[PDB]
Amino acid sequence: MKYLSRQMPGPSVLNKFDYRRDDWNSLSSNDKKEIWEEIIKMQGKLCAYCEKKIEHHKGKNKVERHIEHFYRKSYYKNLTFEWSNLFGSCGEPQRCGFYKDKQKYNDDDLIKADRQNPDVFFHFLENGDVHIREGLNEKEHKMAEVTLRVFNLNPSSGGVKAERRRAIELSMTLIKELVGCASQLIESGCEIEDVRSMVFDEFKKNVKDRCFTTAIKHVFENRMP
Amino acid sequence: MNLETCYVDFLELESHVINEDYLKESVELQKLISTLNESKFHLNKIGIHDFKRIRELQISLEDDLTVFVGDNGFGKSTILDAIAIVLSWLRSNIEKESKPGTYIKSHEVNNSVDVEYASIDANIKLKDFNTSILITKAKEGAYYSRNNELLGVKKLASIYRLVNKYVDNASLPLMAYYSIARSYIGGGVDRTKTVWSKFDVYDEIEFDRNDFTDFFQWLVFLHNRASQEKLSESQTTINALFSDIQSLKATLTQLSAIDSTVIKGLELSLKEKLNYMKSLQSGEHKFNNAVSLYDSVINTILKFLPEFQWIKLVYGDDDYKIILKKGEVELDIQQLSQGEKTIFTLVGDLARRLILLNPNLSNPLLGYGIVLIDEIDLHLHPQWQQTIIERLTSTFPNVQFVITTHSPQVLSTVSSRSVRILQEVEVDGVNDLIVSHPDYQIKGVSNQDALLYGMRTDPIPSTKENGWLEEYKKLVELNRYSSDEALLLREKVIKHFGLDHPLVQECDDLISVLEFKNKINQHFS
Amino acid sequence: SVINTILKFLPEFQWIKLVYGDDDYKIILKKGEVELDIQQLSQGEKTIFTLVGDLARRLILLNPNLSNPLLGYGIVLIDEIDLHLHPQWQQTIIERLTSTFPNVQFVITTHSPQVLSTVSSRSVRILQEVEVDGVNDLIVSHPDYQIKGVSNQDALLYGMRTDPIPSTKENGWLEEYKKLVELNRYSSDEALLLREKVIKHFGLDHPLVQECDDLISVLEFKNKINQH
Amino acid sequence: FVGDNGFGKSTILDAIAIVLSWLRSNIEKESKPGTYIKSHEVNNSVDVEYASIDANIKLKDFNTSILITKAKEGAYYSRNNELLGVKKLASIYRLVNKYVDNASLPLMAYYSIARSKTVWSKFDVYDEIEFDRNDFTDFFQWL
Numbered sequence A: 001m002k003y004l005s006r007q008m009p010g011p012s013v014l015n016k017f018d019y020r021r022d023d024w025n026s027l028s029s030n031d032k033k034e035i036w037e038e039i040i041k042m043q044g045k046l047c048a049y050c051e052k053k054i055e056h057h058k059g060k061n062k063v064e065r066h067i068e069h070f071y072r073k074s075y076y077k078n079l080t081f082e083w084s085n086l087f088g089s090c091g092e093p094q095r096c097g098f099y100k101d102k103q104k105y106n107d108d109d110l111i112k113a114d115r116q117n118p119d120v121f122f123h124f125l126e127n128g129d130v131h132i133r134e135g136l137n138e139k140e141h142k143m144a145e146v147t148l149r150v151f152n153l154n155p156s157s158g159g160v161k162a163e164r165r166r167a168i169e170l171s172m173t174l175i176k177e178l179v180g181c182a183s184q185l186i187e188s189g190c191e192i193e194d195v196r197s198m199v200f201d202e203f204k205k206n207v208k209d210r211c212f213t214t215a216i217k218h219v220f221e222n223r224m225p
Numbered sequence B: 001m002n003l004e005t006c007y008v009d010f011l012e013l014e015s016h017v018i019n020e021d022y023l024k025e026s027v028e029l030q031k032l033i034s035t036l037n038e039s040k041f042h043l044n045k046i047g048i049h050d051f052k053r054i055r056e057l058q059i060s061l062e063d064d065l066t067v068f069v070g071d072n073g074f075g076k077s078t079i080l081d082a083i084a085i086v087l088s089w090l091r092s093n094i095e096k097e098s099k100p101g102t103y104i105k106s107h108e109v110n111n112s113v114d115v116e117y118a119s120i121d122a123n124i125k126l127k128d129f130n131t132s133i134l135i136t137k138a139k140e141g142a143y144y145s146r147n148n149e150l151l152g153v154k155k156l157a158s159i160y161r162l163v164n165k166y167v168d169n170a171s172l173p174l175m176a177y178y179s180i181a182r183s184y185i186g187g188g189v190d191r192t193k194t195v196w197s198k199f200d201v202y203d204e205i206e207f208d209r210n211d212f213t214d215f216f217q218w219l220v221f222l223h224n225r226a227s228q229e230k231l232s233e234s235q236t237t238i239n240a241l242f243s244d245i246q247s248l249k250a251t252l253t254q255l256s257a258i259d260s261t262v263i264k265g266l267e268l269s270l271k272e273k274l275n276y277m278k279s280l281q282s283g284e285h286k287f288n289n290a291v292s293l294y295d296s297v298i299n300t301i302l303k304f305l306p307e308f309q310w311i312k313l314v315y316g317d318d319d320y321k322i323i324l325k326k327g328e329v330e331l332d333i334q335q336l337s338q339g340e341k342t343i344f345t346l347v348g349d350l351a352r353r354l355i356l357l358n359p360n361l362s363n364p365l366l367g368y369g370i371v372l373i374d375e376i377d378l379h380l381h382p383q384w385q386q387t388i389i390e391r392l393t394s395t396f397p398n399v400q401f402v403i404t405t406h407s408p409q410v411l412s413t414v415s416s417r418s419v420r421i422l423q424e425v426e427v428d429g430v431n432d433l434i435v436s437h438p439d440y441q442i443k444g445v446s447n448q449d450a451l452l453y454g455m456r457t458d459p460i461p462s463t464k465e466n467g468w469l470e471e472y473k474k475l476v477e478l479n480r481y482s483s484d485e486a487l488l489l490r491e492k493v494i495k496h497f498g499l500d501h502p503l504v505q506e507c508d509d510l511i512s513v514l515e516f517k518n519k520i521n522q523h524f525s
Numbered sequence C: 001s002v003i004n005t006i007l008k009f010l011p012e013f014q015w016i017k018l019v020y021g022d023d024d025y026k027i028i029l030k031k032g033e034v035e036l037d038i039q040q041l042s043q044g045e046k047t048i049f050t051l052v053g054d055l056a057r058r059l060i061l062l063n064p065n066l067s068n069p070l071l072g073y074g075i076v077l078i079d080e081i082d083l084h085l086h087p088q089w090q091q092t093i094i095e096r097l098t099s100t101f102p103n104v105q106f107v108i109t110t111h112s113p114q115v116l117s118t119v120s121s122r123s124v125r126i127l128q129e130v131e132v133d134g135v136n137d138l139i140v141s142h143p144d145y146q147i148k149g150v151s152n153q154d155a156l157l158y159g160m161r162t163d164p165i166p167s168t169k170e171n172g173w174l175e176e177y178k179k180l181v182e183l184n185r186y187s188s189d190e191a192l193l194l195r196e197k198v199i200k201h202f203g204l205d206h207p208l209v210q211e212c213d214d215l216i217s218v219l220e221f222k223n224k225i226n227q228h
Numbered sequence D: 001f002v003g004d005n006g007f008g009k010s011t012i013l014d015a016i017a018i019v020l021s022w023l024r025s026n027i028e029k030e031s032k033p034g035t036y037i038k039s040h041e042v043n044n045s046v047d048v049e050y051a052s053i054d055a056n057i058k059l060k061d062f063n064t065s066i067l068i069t070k071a072k073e074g075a076y077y078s079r080n081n082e083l084l085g086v087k088k089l090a091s092i093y094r095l096v097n098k099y100v101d102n103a104s105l106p107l108m109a110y111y112s113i114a115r116s117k118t119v120w121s122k123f124d125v126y127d128e129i130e131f132d133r134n135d136f137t138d139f140f141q142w143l
């Protein structure tokens, strides 16, 4: 997960919709296209939860995407058309939105990408596993324990773990070379600060718009002196 | 305590005492049985000379698992056929003394000018007891004739006959062979022994069609017998059976007076009833319940099919029918896929053989034997391939397996010490067979490395687009990537693979780092 | 016409002929400088031989007017094409089938990931099982990437959705040792104990151990710099 | 087609073979029965009533469609099989080959799994759509 910087509201036709009218299915294709125009802009080309690429650069409607509401419709019906409850999720039938609604859970123990930074709780590994950081209190530990369980982001084997491991191992050559140059610089004798700054900014430039960008960022910063 | 020393001690003691009762409780017999129980049966070495397409070969077999890998024209099934010939002799002598086995027929010998005969050499090891057998056959019109040597096999089979003579609950080794024709056998298309003895299994070695029908009859009989246990019938049933047997005996006596087939059938029925009465007496003496065997077989089959809930026998239309519940739908046997039929028949046959050969063991799935399987990965998707080996060696841990495979996925789950690679290398104009081992350990590695090392094949295809990628990579690594030709090649690569493909991204990273290296050098120059 | 069709399908051979010897008769195939009896062929080559022979036999008889009868029209269905085939054979069967008969429509089902790596992504369908409104039904999807020319495991992971790395017990110690290394706890006694088992099972020169040692050295140098 | 075991990969191929059987029978002779759907092949769910198969054959711009259905025990069925579209095509081929000889015909073949005049001088049998591999002995003798 990655922190989302929500921009100014763009509900458009959503404002025209009425709570009393309801009828979520009554939305036309034009409104859906308008919503997707803003959603792609804010979310990039990655899924909110699993960060699998959702839109490919332009024959078939690959990577089917469905609009998902953060909260359940039945008991938070007042937020059916709420702007802040809109999210974009992939079409995977075993995780993300299609898997969130199949279980019973407490609504007060979920991490929201637009509210709190996920980097505080989670810590990714090279092999593709997820490790909960230590030192947190009881409520945060319970929150992190349950969000992975509901979203199925921590399977025993296969699933998203295999894909994450493959993505990590493909980009390891760049990380190894960058730290190779860093070592040289340091040893030779150059202002640590400068070196750092550069090795970071450039990596961030070269990693933007990629699949599983946080896992690669975590791996790189772990090995970057 | 060497096995031979206790064998000769019992042999010399048998001649003195004539009473059988003293012999049955003799200390020497107890020592012989005790030392026989922990003697693990396993073959050691094998060699082939001028048999079919093979000129010469020497192979060492592991005691737990062996896998043969490689493609060639001689056919690896020939090696398994050689083993099937040798074990046949061992089975024959057990059935009856000096019974002939299987000979090498004339046409299996090589057709080359400089050949005269074909031979097969094998060795069997039981703890510290070693035996060897040689089987040979010469061509027609040869100046010298050759004969087999059956001293060791006859001696080994005599011990089993001796032990089985005094104790009626002796355990015997298991031998089986599953060829590639079982695919038709397991089809189960829509095509009654009252007592079962361990000698029925020894009728044939190779898996055949009639085994499935015998499996159905055995399952029906076992379920019916377990029904009486469920009803908890008292000893009055035994009295009724004894009365029926007495009436049959009186009818036989009347028949003997003033119909040979009828007499034979009545005698066979009387013998079967006497066997059933002896089974009732053993029930009084207590034994493993038919319910325990029934659920042992059902759970054994269910271990390999995790997608099924239960299997039951349903009596309808004056007949029996097998019903399997998958998910929330009841299914018939004939409606299953090919893979499930194959697994169902293979595991059912193995379980039946092991159960029938060890009537005395508390858990009959722990007997000894040797099993040869050809093309283990028939009709199996990659998910099942990675777990079939572990389940096979976990359900039956005391049985030695010899397997030939063709898939890297299966090969990635076996240790590197159980892999033999067969290669044909032409030396001095003559093709020669050699056996090698993998360079590195292959247990737990990815299936690509298992294909690269265990099979020595390139895991990347040679399509036209691969040539484009390789050529572009050479230019990038050679630092003159900035050229018109490279631009033309790159446009083709982007057109085919696409800009978001990871392979193209790796090349982009290679370009970027090279561009940055001179920039950083210039910055701190 | 039949013989030439088979020769075109397999260009590794020079000619095929039937020879009546002094006492026997047999079919001889020549490749390079070696002549092989037809019976010496393996099971896979026999299967290919009879499949191509039957296809050519039907095509010749159905088009008696065309100059080249190999340009007919029709539909052919093949089930489990990868049966009884070595991996080296599986990597070229599709190209030859689609090049010998260029005007026929093919429908093929397969289990081997090696075949998938030679097929374009526009002709791949994947069958899954999903439940909608309480009813479980099948569904058809498409691959999200291009799988032509990629390695074997990439094709297995993307075109079949399966883990390419087994879950063996010996693997269990590997990820635990890796995880302890990444948490800067490689000097712990538990890591030292686990390293004995791993190094015993794999060996010093195995590449997996080599990369682990490289990570150890990198982390050690970073700790040295941070400490100073 | 890629999938696991028990996912209906062989069902699709058998469905297409069922569809093509009727066209072949009509080509050989008008008003000839093809291959029917077996009773055990129907779904075993509680609420099912009938099973239907539909197909579309496109020849340049000419289009045709064939539907075959069978009901096990449902009171209401989908009438009968609609074979009107395939009879026009069969009559077209019969017309073209009746006047001018040495014509051409489409090829239909199905290489199944284990399971289990009129140019007959050569001994090749066109009557059977199904053919089985691993029969090298027969082809060797034919050659």
Ligand SMILES: Nc1ncnc2c1ncn2[C@@H]1O[C@H](COP(=O)(O)OP(=O)(O)OP(=O)(O)O)[C@@H](O)[C@H]1O
Residues within 6 Å of the ligand: B326, B329, B331, B335, B336, B337, B338, B339, B379, D004, D005, D006, D007, D008, D009, D010, D011, D012, D040, D041, D042, D043, D044, D045, D113
């Ligand atoms: N009458 C039936 N009702 C419901 N499901 C059935 C019925 N008959 C068969 N099936 C289903 O058919 C499935 C197997 O179908 P199928 O033979 O197409 O599988 P496959 O693995 O693709 O086959 P193959 O190995 O022949 O290619 C089983 O899982 C079973 O659930």
Ligand SMILES: [Zn+2]
Residues within 6 Å of the ligand: A047, A048, A049, A050, A051, A052, A089, A090, A091, A092, A095, A096
């Ligand atoms: Zn997602």
